[PDB]
Amino acid sequence: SDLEVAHYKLKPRSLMLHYEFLQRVKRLPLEYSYGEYRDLFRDFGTHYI
Amino acid sequence: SSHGCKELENALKAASGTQNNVLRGEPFIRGGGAGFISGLSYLELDNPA
Structure with missing residues (x-):
């Protein structure tokens, strides 16, 4: 049984981020060092819906 | 006096x-209510209608 109940779409533009994600981004190093972006993905993952 | 008999049977099933x-x-x-959808789409093999 495949049941579908609602269709959701995010707006394409000018999204208001969550505080926590905002700040974690704010703390990302400007020089590349994989460990921090790794921790970022492990906290928040890689993609949004 | 002398006597001989041989008897043979073979049967196959x-x-x-x-x-x-x-x-x-x-x-x-x-369309319709998700509960009605799922309840009605569920195939009553005794009454496929």
Whole structure:
């Protein structure tokens, strides 16, 4: 049984981020060092819906 | 006086039988209440309507 109940779409533009994600981004190093972006993905993952 | 008899019997039975019984069904609904959709789309094999 495949049941579908609602269709959701995010707006394409000018999204208001969550505080926590905002700040974690704010703390990302400007020089590349994989460990921090790794921790970022492990906290928040890689993609949004 | 002398006597001889020989007696021989051979009997063979072979039997076989098979069934294939396939049943398929795909009720499909658009619109209405999700509970009514799921309840009605669920295939009552005794009453497919």
